[PDB]
RNA sequence: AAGCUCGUAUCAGUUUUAUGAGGUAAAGCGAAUGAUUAGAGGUUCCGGGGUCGAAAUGACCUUGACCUAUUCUCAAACUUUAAAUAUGUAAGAAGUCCUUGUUACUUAAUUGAACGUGGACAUUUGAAUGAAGAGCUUUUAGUGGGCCAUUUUUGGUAAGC
RNA sequence: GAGAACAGAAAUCUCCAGUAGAACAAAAGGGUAAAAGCCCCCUUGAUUUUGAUUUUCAGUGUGAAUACAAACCAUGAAAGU
RNA sequence: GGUUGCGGCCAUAUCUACCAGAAAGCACCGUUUCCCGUCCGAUCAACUGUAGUUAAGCUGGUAAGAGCCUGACCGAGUAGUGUAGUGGGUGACCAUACGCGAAACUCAGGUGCUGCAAUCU
């Protein structure tokens, strides 16, 4: 018949990365977490206690509780037509902090400066992010740079 | 050069392979006790042969390592028997050497028909000072080439003190 | 290596080196994992280690935190700091281990406020005990033995350090059964013998049991003692007055230097070879194919 | 389908203006085989706005036809004339969004010439109508408007 | 009792090769792949002419052997059993199944029926080297093999020196100079990498930079 | 269907930027595993044959195995690398920053954790586009035989299977 | 790989190499090298209380698992488990 | 700069063959009364720091070295792929349109960075 165990299909998901087997480096543990931090989920195959289910691999939630060897993470999983709130008790080896937020944090604190450094000046700020604007004009010289004129080649074989 | 890159004997390990266990073994054991002083060690079969008449884990034989002073004693006293002439074969390319003698009597020791007579595999392992490193726990490293006991550097040491003969090609 | 050993290109390629502090045979990480790591809801609270090493003679006692950038020594006292208080001979012995432990205990605790409170045992018949928390006010300093690779045997000197760090007012959790005079065939301690080993009453009785059965050997080793006229007996005060000398001032005095860092800097780059630029390396090869090839 | 909905192109031959950046240039990417478009002239922006140009006021498609309608609604952003609008369109203003959102999507009839091609749903380059035909979009529009 | 080839021409199914899963599979009709003077030296045959496919299809093992045979048979008896080196650069590794025949059409999974080789488009099937003085005698060989095969495939003169990677002159350069040295029936080349030691041990003939 | 609480409001089968996850396609095989053609060079006190031999831990042929550097060809249940499409999260007022209270948890320690009091900076307040709005509750129908097309794809020689 | 009486392809003793090519009941795939493997040592946490969580999911049950709380314990010098 | 105790990243750190290393530190190294462990004080425990040694460990340098790390309009805008057509072809398959875009190869450059504490011509 069919077969549908907790870690089935996790061939290459729960593996180890090339020449990267062994005892998990000692920083992994030295990392500190608080209720609120955003965390990414990557299950360490070597670390079987307090693993996550495969579904949460590559998923990313918020620490809701901190314990001895673990963090409680919540995740909005969506069944049917709606999202539920799942709670994950992972070990501090299956979780790393998320640089999805660094962008933001780095942008507020940098937005602090531009803001202050222009109030005590003359307002004039503009600090929302604009997208990619089409290029303004330009003039290109041919000096040193005369155009080498190409045509398409004919059919060679050379097997 | 050449300071304390001498050449002691690491240890000397006699061994009596006995196609059985029982009286026959304890005797071979006893033999190696009185010969060595140290109470000897027994060895179980590694699997089952049936054409060597053995079963796995049977306590098949005995042996004993001895190092330092008392070694060379029993080295000479058995090198006596081998009339200080061996074979080019006898020397491991990694530096050590050994030989076999029938009759443990040929090297002191009475007879006693309650003990019988046995053979010995005499095996001599050399090494140099600073043998340590590759056997201590902390910073267990490996000794550099210009120090690794070699066949040549061992026949040479042997050819000398003992003034014995090499033999063969 | 022999031609029929020899490492394949494939082998070296698909190989994964251990760490480095393990390739060097220096660090048991499996222990480190379990020394270093903190209750994840105790947050940035440092977990500290009483590091006890033995050089080939000279005892090392470092108190150390951990930091993902690199472990942080709060405090460090070495047995070769034991002139100042009163030891010049035997500093790899159990009792210079006890001394360092005490020196380590008293010197930190000092630079940590709990100097006057938490004095540990001053009397020392070495009964089994642990520096207990005080009635209202600061819990003691707590710190764990980092025994390293040292092999845990009942009586080793690595634990002497511990008994002396415990005596000098540190909470360093421990059971008794590795202190000399721990009875095998009964869970039971004879402190008459530990109080011995603390004051070197095994070295003494070795200085005494040779002063009449072999004066050849006694001279070779135990030399330095003669050179200062200290026969046995007086060695028990030597450590007792060492003890005192330490508890009174352990404030650490460094070395005077003589020649600066930059000075040492010079006279070391002397005996240090340097790498070679590719231009150089080119010529060497080129010179080598002029040579090795063209038929002399 | 969503992207057509977002660019407010909910029925055929109806058309809008789009300010060009990565985040829309990519939108246009997604819907090449369904729209035709390009760079509008001054000429036809005027005529789009003048003839079939309407403004959305409490939903309710209000046909422009008097400058009071515009000031009433875009006046807060500058813009107080039907040509002030056009300016704020054709030049891309500091208020293109509010400007452009204001005008109801244009409702152009079928090309009065014919699409010129024999089958519509190929790329311009491939002799079809869809995809970016650059300034060749003015001859189209002007004949649908 | 062999099923007509038209049954498997196209690659309708993913690679089904003999494995620890397969196991029951039979022996390939084409078991030999180098005919003629294969023991010969690179210099001994500069000309190379390929049989090359124009279709993404499958080639029956039996079709291979029977085609290899035809075009070895000809080439020899005409130019001489040592006047060419005929290599087959295609291996039947793909097991075909069949549904032999109470039961109906349930549990249809077949048992192995024959091998076939999976060819791409532009992929060489045959490669033959001689001297540029057999050309017709070769080419005519491949043209007669052509028939033993399904799908359009076409003959091609190799811009290269025989079975080597190196085109006619650029080969010569490396040999009329110093870098080439014989080996078996192929060749090794002077690497500019690695131990300067054995690099001059072997290829002593280099290192003078003349003839 | 009934509505209900609210309203610029929070909304999105879309983009953008930032930051994860993934082993398919390709690719690889003089990289591991497993297949597979061909020579060449080595190695046996030693797999077997033969010449000289009284034998040899003897020499010489011989064919095999292995070792060396090469060589043609492959994998749904191999893989170092590794896309495209798809996919998790983040883009502020529930935000950031200063001061300094609560506790029985927690620290060597008013240390730290969590919850706070008092203060500081408004809409370029933190991308795009769109929004005939947004959120919420209750109750009940029909349905629970499906079929087709492009692309992915399993079985079958195939099928309007 | 190289060495030692009988000892032979296969018995036992020694050294060198050895990224795991072994072993971990079982099917297979993950995982493991001062261990997760091999030997030794001491034991009963395979225990008591009742919640939460993950998978299958209706977000019912069952099975299986996970991280805490409250106890009583085992082991270790200890951190710990 | 060296070196040591403790480290973080865990080969730019590993493997192979050579060579060079003051000063200190490590180290090899001596002893067996004691706690301790062994078939064997080799390992482990203990004692001296004395009797001895740079030989090895350790550090560094060398090599058209193996491995590995990095880069490139090297290959290659190729293989693959998202999107489109009443495009070609009997098919098998293949061109074209708007986008995204590999690995191999090939060439060059590189061969540990560094945190705390103690020490050293
Ligand atoms: Mg299944
Ligand atoms: Mg490992
Ligand atoms: Mg908060
Ligand atoms: Mg378990
Ligand atoms: Mg190679
Ligand atoms: Mg341990
Ligand atoms: Mg619009
Ligand atoms: Mg008309
Ligand atoms: Mg007309
Ligand atoms: Mg028509
Ligand atoms: Mg159409
Ligand atoms: Mg009109
Ligand atoms: Mg099929
Ligand atoms: Mg079946
Ligand atoms: Mg044909
Ligand atoms: Mg992404
Ligand atoms: Mg898969
Ligand atoms: Mg493939
Ligand atoms: Mg590849
Ligand atoms: Mg998305
Ligand atoms: Mg039903
Ligand atoms: Mg129903
Ligand atoms: Mg029905
Ligand atoms: Mg034997
Ligand atoms: Mg065993
Ligand atoms: Mg049970
Ligand atoms: Mg089940
Ligand atoms: Mg020195
Ligand atoms: Mg030297
Ligand atoms: Mg060292
Ligand atoms: Mg080095
Ligand atoms: Mg290299």
Curated annotation (Swiss-Prot), chain A:
Q: Give compartment(s).
A: Cytoplasm
Q: Among the record's GO biological process terms, what is one?
A: cytoplasmic translation
Tell me the GO molecular function terms: structural constituent of ribosome
Matching InterPro entries = Ribosomal_eL21, Ribosomal_eL21_CS, Ribosomal_eL21_sf, Translation_prot_SH3-like_sf
Q: Which UniProt keywords apply?
A: Cytoplasm, Isopeptide bond, Ribonucleoprotein, Ribosomal protein, Ubl conjugation
Q: Which residues cross the membrane?
A: none
Cellular component terms (Gene Ontology): cytosol; cytosolic large ribosomal subunit
Q: Name one Pfam family in it.
A: Ribosomal_L21e
Claim: Magnesium is one of the keywords in the record: no
Cross-link Glycyl lysine isopeptide (Lys-Gly) (interchain with G-Cter in ubiquitin) mapped to chain: 31
Please give the superkingdom of this protein's source: Eukaryota
The role this protein plays is: Component of the ribosome, a large ribonucleoprotein complex responsible for the synthesis of proteins in the cell. The small ribosomal subunit (SSU) binds messenger RNAs (mRNAs) and translates the encoded message by selecting cognate aminoacyl-transfer RNA (tRNA) molecules. The large subunit (LSU) contains the ribosomal catalytic site termed the peptidyl transferase center (PTC), which catalyzes the formation of peptide bonds, thereby polymerizing the amino acids delivered by tRNAs into a polypeptide chain.
Give the misc comment: There are 2 genes for eL21 in yeast.
How is this protein organized at the quaternary level?
Component of the large ribosomal subunit (LSU). Mature yeast ribosomes consist of a small (40S) and a large (60S) subunit. The 40S small subunit contains 1 molecule of ribosomal RNA (18S rRNA) and 33 different proteins (encoded by 57 genes). The large 60S subunit contains 3 rRNA molecules (25S, 5.8S and 5S rRNA) and 46 different proteins (encoded by 81 genes).
For this entry, the protein name equals Large ribosomal subunit protein eL21A
UniProtKB/Swiss-Prot annotation, chain B:
| GO biological process, alphabetically ordered | cytoplasmic translation; ribosomal large subunit assembly; translation
Example of a GO MF term: RNA binding
Keyword Cell wall biogenesis/degradation listed? The answer is: no
Q: Can you supply one Gene Ontology CC term for this chain's record?
A: cytosol
Q: Which domain of life is it from?
A: Eukaryota
State the InterPro entries in the record.
Ribosomal_uL5, Ribosomal_uL5_C, Ribosomal_uL5_CS, Ribosomal_uL5_dom_sf, Ribosomal_uL5_N
Record localization: Cytoplasm; Nucleus
Q: Which residues carry this modification: N6,N6,N6-trimethyllysine?
A: 70
Query: Whom does it interact with, and what assembly results?
Result: Component of the large ribosomal subunit (LSU). Mature yeast ribosomes consist of a small (40S) and a large (60S) subunit. The 40S small subunit contains 1 molecule of ribosomal RNA (18S rRNA) and 33 different proteins (encoded by 57 genes). The large 60S subunit contains 3 rRNA molecules (25S, 5.8S and 5S rRNA) and 46 different proteins (encoded by 81 genes). Component of a hexameric 5S RNP precursor complex, composed of 5S RNA, RRS1, RPF2, RPL5, RPL11A/RPL11B and SYO1; this complex acts as a precursor for ribosome assembly.
Family of this protein: Belongs to the universal ribosomal protein uL5 family.
Anything else known: Present with 39000 molecules/cell in log phase SD medium. There are 2 genes for uL5 in yeast.
What protein am I looking at?
Answer: Large ribosomal subunit protein uL5A
Swiss-Prot record, chain D:
* Record flagged with keyword Ribosomal protein: yes
Identify the keywords attached in UniProt to this record, alphabetized. Answer: Cytoplasm, Ribonucleoprotein, Ribosomal protein
- BP-aspect Gene Ontology terms: cytoplasmic translation; maturation of LSU-rRNA; maturation of LSU-rRNA from tricistronic rRNA transcript (SSU-rRNA, 5.8S rRNA, LSU-rRNA); ribosomal large subunit biogenesis
Query: Which cellular components does GO assign to this protein?
Result: cytoplasm; cytosol; cytosolic large ribosomal subunit
Provide any one GO MF term from the record.
structural constituent of ribosome
Q: Could you name the domain of life of the organism this protein comes from?
A: Eukaryota
Q: What is its main location?
A: cytoplasm
Q: Where does this protein reside within or beyond the cell? A: Cytoplasm
Chain's role: Component of the ribosome, a large ribonucleoprotein complex responsible for the synthesis of proteins in the cell. The small ribosomal subunit (SSU) binds messenger RNAs (mRNAs) and translates the encoded message by selecting cognate aminoacyl-transfer RNA (tRNA) molecules. The large subunit (LSU) contains the ribosomal catalytic site termed the peptidyl transferase center (PTC), which catalyzes the formation of peptide bonds, thereby polymerizing the amino acids delivered by tRNAs into a polypeptide chain.
The similarity comment for this entry is:
Belongs to the universal ribosomal protein uL30 family.
Which protein, by its recorded name, is this?
A: Large ribosomal subunit protein uL30A
Q: What is the taxonomic lineage of the source species?
A: Eukaryota, Fungi, Dikarya, Ascomycota, Saccharomycotina
**Record gene name:** RPL7A
Q: Specify first residue, last residue and whole-protein length for the fragment.
A: 100 to 244 of 244
Curated annotation (Swiss-Prot), chain E:
- Output the InterPro entries linked to this UniProt entry: Ribosomal_uL16, Ribosomal_uL16_CS_euk_arc, Ribosomal_uL16_dom, Ribosomal_uL16_euk_arch, Ribosomal_uL16_sf
Q: Which GO terms describe its molecular function?
A: structural constituent of ribosome
Q: Which SUPFAM superfamilies match?
A: Ribosomal protein L16p/L10e
User: Which processes are annotated in GO (biological process)?
Assistant: cytoplasmic translation; ribosomal large subunit assembly; translation; translational termination
Question: Which compartments is it annotated to reside in?
Answer: Cytoplasm
Q: Carries keyword Transmembrane helix?
A: no
Record has Cell division as a keyword = no
On assembly, the entry states: Component of the large ribosomal subunit (LSU). Mature yeast ribosomes consist of a small (40S) and a large (60S) subunit. The 40S small subunit contains 1 molecule of ribosomal RNA (18S rRNA) and 33 different proteins (encoded by 57 genes). The large 60S subunit contains 3 rRNA molecules (25S, 5.8S and 5S rRNA) and 46 different proteins (encoded by 81 genes).
The family classification in the record reads: Belongs to the universal ribosomal protein uL16 family.
Protein name from the UniProt record = Large ribosomal subunit protein uL16
Q: Which organism is it from?
A: Saccharomyces cerevisiae (strain ATCC 204508 / S288c)
Q: Which gene encodes it?
A: RPL10
């Amino acid at each position: 018949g069919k077969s549908h165990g907790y870690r089935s299909r996790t061939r290459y998901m729960f593996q180890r990365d090339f020449r990267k087997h062994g005892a998990v480096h000692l920083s992994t543990y030295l990392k500190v977490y608080k209720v609120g931090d955003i965390v990414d989920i990557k299950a360490n195959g070597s670390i079987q206690k307090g693993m996550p289910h495969k579904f949460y691999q590559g998923k990313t939630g918020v620490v809701y509780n901190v314990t001895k060897s673990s963090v409680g993470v919540i995740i909005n999983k969506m069944v049917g037509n709606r999202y539920l709130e799942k709670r994950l008790n992972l070990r501090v080896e299956h979780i790393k902090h998320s640089k999805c937020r660094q962008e933001f944090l780095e942008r507020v604190k940098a937005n602090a400066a531009k803001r202050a450094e222009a109030k005590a000046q003359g307002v004039a700020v503009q600090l929302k992010r604009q997208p990619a604007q089409p290029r303004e004009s330009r003039i290109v010289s041919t000096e040193g740079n005369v155009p080498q004129t190409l045509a398409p080649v004919p059919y060679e074989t050379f097997i | 050069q050449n300071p304390m890159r001498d050449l002691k004997i690491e240890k000397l390990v006699l061994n009596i392979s006995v196609g059985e266990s029982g009286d026959r073994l304890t005797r071979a054991s006893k033999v190696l006790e009185q010969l060595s002083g140290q109470t000897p060690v027994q060895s179980k079969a590694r699997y089952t042969v049936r054409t060597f008449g053995i079963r796995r884990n049977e306590k098949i034989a005995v042996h004993v390592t001895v190092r330092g002073p008392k070694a060379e004693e029993i080295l000479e006293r058995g090198l006596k028997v081998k009339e200080y002439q061996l074979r080019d074969r006898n020397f491991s390319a990694t530096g050590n050497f050994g030989f076999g003698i029938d009759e443990h009597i040929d090297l002191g020791i009475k007879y006693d028909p309650s003990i019988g007579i046995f053979g010995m595999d005499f095996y001599v392992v050399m090494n140099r000072p600073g043998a340590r490193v590759t056997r201590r726990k902390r910073c267990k490293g490996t000794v550099g080439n210009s120090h690794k006991t070699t066949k040549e550097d061992t026949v040479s040491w042997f050819k000398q003190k003992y003034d014995a003969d090499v033999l063969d090609k | 290596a022999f031609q029929k050993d020899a490492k394949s290109s494939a082998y070296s390629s698909r190989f994964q080196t251990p760490f480095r502090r393990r390739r060097e045979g220096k660090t048991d990480y499996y222990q480190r994992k379990r020394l270093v790591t903190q209750h994840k809801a105790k947050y940035n609270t440092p977990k500290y280690r009483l590091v006890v090493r033995f050089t080939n003679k000279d005892i090392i006692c470092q108190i150390i935190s951990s930091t993902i950038t690199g472990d942080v020594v709060l405090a460090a006292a070495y047995s070769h700091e034991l002139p100042r208080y009163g030891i010049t001979h035997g500093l790899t012995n159990w009792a210079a281990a006890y001394a360092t432990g005490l020196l380590i205990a008293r010197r930190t605790l000092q630079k940590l406020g709990l100097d006057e409170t938490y004095k540990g045992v001053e009397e020392v018949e070495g009964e089994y005990e642990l520096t207990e928390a005080v009635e209202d006010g600061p819990r003691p300093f707590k710190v764990f033995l980092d025994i390293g690779l040292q092999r845990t045997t009942t009586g080793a000197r690595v634990f002497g350090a511990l008994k002396g760090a415990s005596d000098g007012g540190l909470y360093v959790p421990h059971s008794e059964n590795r202190f000399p005079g721990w009875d095998f065939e009964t869970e039971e301690i004879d402190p008459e013998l530990l109080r011995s080993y603390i004051f070197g009453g095994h070295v003494s009785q070795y200085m005494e049991e040779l002063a009449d059965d072999d004066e050849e050997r006694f001279s070779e080793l135990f030399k330095g003692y003669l050179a200062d006229d200290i026969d046995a007996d007086s060695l028990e005060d030597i450590y007792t007055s060492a003890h005192e000398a330490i508890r009174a001032d352990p404030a650490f005095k460094p070395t005077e230097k003589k020649f600066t860092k930059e000075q040492y800097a010079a006279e070391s780059k002397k005996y240090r070879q340097t790498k070679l630029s590719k231009e150089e390396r080119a010529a060497r090869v080129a010179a080598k194919i002029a040579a090795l090839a063209g038929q002399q | 389908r969503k992207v057509l909905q977002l660019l407010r192109l909910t029925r055929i031959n109806s058309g809008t203006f789009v300010k060009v950046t990565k985040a829309t240039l990519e939108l246009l990417k997604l819907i090449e085989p369904y729209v035709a478009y390009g760079y509008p002239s001054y000429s036809t922006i005027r005529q789009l706005v003048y003839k079939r140009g309407f403004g959305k006021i409490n939903k309710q498609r209000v046909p422009l036809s008097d400058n009071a309608i515009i000031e009433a609604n875009l006046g807060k952003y500058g813009i107080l004339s039907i040509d002030d609008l056009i300016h704020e369109i054709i030049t891309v203003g500091p208020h293109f969004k509010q400007a452009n959102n204001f005008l109801w999507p244009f409702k152009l009839s079928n090309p009065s010439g014919g699409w010129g091609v024999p089958r519509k749903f190929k790329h311009f380059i491939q002799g079809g109508s869809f995809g970016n035909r650059e300034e060749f979009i003015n001859k189209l529009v002007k004949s649908m408007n | 009792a062999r099923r007509p080839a038209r049954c498997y021409r196209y690659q309708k199914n993913k690679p089904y090769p003999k494995s620890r899963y397969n196991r029951a599979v039979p022996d390939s009709k084409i078991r030999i792949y180098d005919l003629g003077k294969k023991k010969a030296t690179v210099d001994e045959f500069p000309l190379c002419v390929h049989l090359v496919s124009n279709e993404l299809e499958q080639l029956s093992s039996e079709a291979l052997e029977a085609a290899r045979i035809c075009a070895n048979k000809y080439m020899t008896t005409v130019s001489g059993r040592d006047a060419f080196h005929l290599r087959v650069r295609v291996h039947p590794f793909h097991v075909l199944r069949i549904n032999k025949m109470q039961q109906g059409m349930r549990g249809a999974w077949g048992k192995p029926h024959g091998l076939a080789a999976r060819v791409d488009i532009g992929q060489i099937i045959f490669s033959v080297r001689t001297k540029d003085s057999n050309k017709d005698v070769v080419v005519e060989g491949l043209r007669r093999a052509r028939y033993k095969f399904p799908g359009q495939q076409k003959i091609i003169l190799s811009k290269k020196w025989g079975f080597t990677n190196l085109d006619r002159p650029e080969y010569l350069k490396k040999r009329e100079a110093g870098e080439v040295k014989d080996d078996g029936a192929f060749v090794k080349f002077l690497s500019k990498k690695g131990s300067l030691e054995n690099n001059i041990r072997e290829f002593p003939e280099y290192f003078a930079a003349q003839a």
